[PDB]
A paper describes a structure:
The membrane domain of the mycobacterial ATP synthase is embedded in the IPM, with the catalytic F1-domain of the enzyme extending into the bacterial cytoplasm and attached to the membrane domain by a central stalk and a peripheral stalk (PS). As do other ATP synthases in eubacteria, chloroplasts, and mitochondria, the enzyme couples a proton-motive force (pmf) across the IPM generated by respiration to the synthesis in the F1-domain of the enzyme of ATP from adenosine diphosphate (ADP) and phosphate by a mechanical rotary mechanism. The mycobacterial rotor consists of a membrane-bound ring of nine c-subunits, attached to an elongated central stalk, made of single copies of the γ- and ε-subunits. The mycobacterial PS is made of two proteins, bδ and b′.
Similar to the prior study, the electron density maps for each of states S1 to S3 has density for both tethered and untethered forms, and hence those particle classes contain enzymes that are auto-inhibited and others that are not inhibited by this mechanism. In the tethered forms the mycobacterial-specific extensions of the α-subunit make contact with the γ-subunit. In the first element described before, residues 520 to 548 extend from the C-terminal region of α-subunits and provide a “hook” which catches into a “loop” provided by residues 212 to 220 in the lower globular domain of the γ-subunit, thereby tethering the stator and rotor together and inhibiting rotation. An important feature of this tether mechanism is that it is unidirectional, operating only in the hydrolytic direction of rotation when their interacting surfaces have complementary charges. In contrast, in the synthetic direction, as the interacting surfaces are both negatively charged they will repel each other, thereby preventing an inhibited complex from forming. In the mycobacterial ATP synthase it is not known whether the ε-subunit, which is observed in the “down” position in the structure, can also assume the “up” position, but there is no evidence that it does so.
Numbering used by the authors:
A (entry chain O), F (entry chain M), G (entry chain L), H (entry chain T), I (entry chain S), J (entry chain R), ...: 2 to 86
B (entry chain G): 18 to 213, 220 to 269
C (entry chain C): 532 to 545
D (entry chain H): 3 to 120
E (entry chain N): 3 to 86
L (entry chain P): 1 to 86
Write the structure that this text describes.
């Protein structure tokens, strides 16, 4: 009666909201922690800066990657609603 | 003469008493700093350039500790003989000695020998102070540290040509009757592993250890200077006694 | 013959 | 109470009971009480040590090359040089202070801090 | 009932959650990077000039994510996909 | 069956509540962390206090800025609900 | 048919409770973190307490304000529900 | 036709649960952080336990204060629900 | 068959669920952090084993309470739900 | 015409899900923190490992308990839902 | 009819989603904390590596277990739902 | 009234999958951040120990992303192969 497809769409869109919100909080906190470590390392020794970008960019790579995944899956939850009947 | 030499002998005995008092007075600080250095070394990586020998060494900073006044009988003679022996050993090993001097007598001897003296600190062998020891240790340690990047006859990025080793040639005061000139290598030091609540370091053990080794070297050079002064006073007493007997 | 200056470490020989 | 022992390379300076031991460290200021945990630290180049005890006024000292070793029942302060409060002279400290040399400036500042001007 | 009503309610819920999560992430990460910068400047007084620039990387990354959500949040509350 | 306005307004208010929840969590925790760093700094280096505000406030600003930004959007949701019927 | 007032009020109350919960979490965590900073500082240097209250309070205020602010808005959600039909 | 009072009470209970969850999380985390600070302080300087308890009590009081404030609002929600009809 | 009592029961169930979730999170975090502090302190000073427990068991005693309190009020939602008829 | 016991069971299921999910968060964080403390203590003073277990499993207890206690009540929500009509 | 089976199944699915959320949060955070501890211990004490693994894998074995335990219960909710009509 | 059972079931399943993914992403991001903090501190302190220090970081990443990938798999199962679908 109430257009069950409407309920499916609303649920899928809230789900994608959850996807990207969780991804955002996780990525933000992880990037903050990694940046804190990088800042402390640089402050303790300036010259070491030269190399710290290698490990740091790996860490964010894992963080950003974990974020990117969510993005993609978020789309599958909103722009292609699964089980739309 | 007889009166002069006897008065000098008695003055030398008093000076020996004072020098022994000074040597004993510095013992607690040296013992406690050695204890702290052992603690830090135990709880930190032993990677300091001061603590690791360089490869293909080709220079050596030798310190010759002699007396300012000349009345001491053979003190300077023994010190310089030991210095010559050390120079022969270094030449055999393949390193070119770099010479640092203390006292005017060694300056005179080496100038007569036409050997080159990098730096000389004179005027305190009769009663050295920790400022002189700190200056000597600082100069020697700077020379040694500059010797890391220096390669072959090339100073590398430093521009200054350093040394790959530091030796102190000085007279130990074994007893009131015994003095002996020996050459002791103070850098690069070697790590000795003795079998057998924790100390909380601030900020980290490595920085404290790095900042403490130079002070340990300075303390050891100061101890060497005190031993040298005591030995010089003993040799002066013996020479004055013999002269009065002559 | 030549005295070497060393820093004692309270650890077993590694 | 804890027994402070301020030791210098050229001789032993001070020893005896105390209650509080304030000082400065590269990590930061630090105040040692009777039952402090074992610790090892390096004082700042212009460090000052305030040993506050009972029955008499505090003891303010300027220190060059101070390394602080805190252990149970005793405290050691291995100082390249040390000077008590009464002996320090303000004019000489000020003259040495502001000099280009880092060591001279550090020792002048230490003398001033021990005095009270800071 | 109006399907647009359900879709818009769900979109508002999703956008609110997106922005809340993004705000949490941005605040936490920025505060952590701050703590780092303040500690570095306290320990190394002269390092601020060399610390601000690396510091601006962290936020420059962290806040970026937040802004992503920001933009995408609009697509929920202003351009609700599949509202029909 | 029922007026869409009720459901859409309820959803808007829940969304704004989520806005404020996220902003509160982030701002409070970030300010706590920055204040911890500042408190340690002054506890260790008294004279450093005057020179610690310049970075501290900055972070605080940004740490707070997002919250205030979020605040604005919450007002949009509750009062200027886009798509409101 | 559902009463619009009931649905709107229930949504508003849930939103307000969510806001207050988020504010409580933020305030508690930030205040505990600042208190930890103060405790560590006083343990390291007892007499520092006198000079640590001034920054400490600021930090607490910088958090507490936000908390109370949420309270205000939370009240607006329950006592004067926006868009209350 | 669902009873409006039923939805009012359901929303009230959900909001009270949210408020209590937030308050409990905040109080627990603040307690943990402050207690860790106190434990470290007592470990380092046992003679300063008396001087340490005062700041610890201040911070825990300003945390549990917010927690009890949340308690009071949840009690209001479960005894005097705003907008009840 | 929209019996209100069922709706109130569901609301109480979910409210108590949030209460327990927040309480468990808070208790776990607080106990873990207080532990971490205690383990670190004993590792530094083993003989302090006796002295460190006294502050530790304060922190725990104050955080578990904040959780156990929730427990009591959780019962108030389910066993004797306010307003439920 | 949805059954009342059906919605009661749905609410109880959601409540239990929140309960033991929050318990999971608390347990994971607390156990991880205690493990970090144990690892640091052993790394600094390995000989003390045997001593550190005895209190290390106390905090985990004090942590795990809540989780399990939480889980217990979750069963009381699922196997025998309170107030089920 | 609204098929109360569908309502209870959706409630079970939401519960299980929350179960995964909580378990994943706990596992990820606890294992990150333990990994940080292990990495720090290795860095400070290269020789102590052999000692660190046994406590580390204990910590993992705890936190993951909790996470995995939660996973198990999700099955009981999403495969044999207690309370299906 | 008379709402399709499949619609409600799928809506609940999709919201549950959203929760699964949010939790997994938070866990992965925070675990990576903390492990990377430890790794970067080690690298800065000990450039030589970089090779030695990788391995614990690899183990931590493995555990964290193993939990993350289990969460991904379960979310995929729920969204596609929804239990109770009918």
């Amino acid at each position: 009666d109430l257009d069950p497809n409407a309920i499916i769409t609303a649920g899928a869109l809230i789900g994608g909201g959850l996807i990207m919100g969780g991804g955002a909080i996780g990525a933000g906190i992880g990037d903050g922690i990694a940046g804190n470590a990088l800042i402390s390392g640089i402050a303790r020794q300036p010259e070491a800066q030269g190399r710290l970008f290698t490990p740091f960019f790996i860490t964010v790579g894992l963080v950003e990657a974990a974020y990117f995944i969510n993005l993609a899956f978020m789309a599958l939850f909103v722009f292609a609603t699964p089980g739309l009947q | 003469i007889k009166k002069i030499t006897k008065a000098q002998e008695l003055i030398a005995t008093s000076r020996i008493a004072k020098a022994q008092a000074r040597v004993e007075a510095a013992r607690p600080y040296a013992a406690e700093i050695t204890n702290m250095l052992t603690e830090l070394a135990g709880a930190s990586a032993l990677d300091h350039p001061l603590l690791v020998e360089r490869k293909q060494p080709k220079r050596a900073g030798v310190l010759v500790v002699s007396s300012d006044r000349g009345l001491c009988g053979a003190y300077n003679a023994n010190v310089l003989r030991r210095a010559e022996e050390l120079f022969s050993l270094l030449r055999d090993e393949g390193k070119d000695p770099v010479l640092y001097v203390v006292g005017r007598k060694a300056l005179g001897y080496f100038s007569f020998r036409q050997r080159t003296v990098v730096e000389s600190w004179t005027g305190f062998s009769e009663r050295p102070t920790y400022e002189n020891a700190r200056e000597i240790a600082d100069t020697l340690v700077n020379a040694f540290m500059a010797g890391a990047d220096d390669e072959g006859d090339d100073a590398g990025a430093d521009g200054i040509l350093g040394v790959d080793e530091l030796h102190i040639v000085f007279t130990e005061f074994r007893s009131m009757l015994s003095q002996t000139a020996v050459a002791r290598r103070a850098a690069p030091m070697e790590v000795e592993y003795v079998g057998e609540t924790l100390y909380s370091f601030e900020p980290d053990p490595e920085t404290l250890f790095d900042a403490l080794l130079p002070r340990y070297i300075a303390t050891r050079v100061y101890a060497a200077l005190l031993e040298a002064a005591a030995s010089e006073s003993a040799s002066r007493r013996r020479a004055m006694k013999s002269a009065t007997d002559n | 013959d030549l005295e070497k200056e060393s820093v004692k470490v309270r650890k077993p020989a590694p | 109470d804890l027994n402070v022992e301020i030791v210098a390379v050229e001789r032993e300076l001070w020893s005896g009971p105390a209650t509080f031991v304030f000082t400065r460290t590269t990590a930061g200021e630090i105040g040692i009480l009777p039952r402090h945990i074992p610790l090892v630290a390096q004082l700042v180049d212009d460090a000052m040590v305030r040993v506050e005890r009972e029955g008499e006024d505090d003891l303010r000292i300027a220190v060059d090359g101070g390394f602080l070793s805190v252990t149970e029942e005793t405290v050691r302060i291995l100082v390249e040089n040390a000077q008590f409060e009464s002996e320090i002279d303000a004019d000489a400290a000020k003259e040495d202070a502001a000099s280009d040399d880092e060591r001279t400036a550090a020792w002048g500042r230490a003398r001033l801090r021990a005095l009270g001007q800071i």
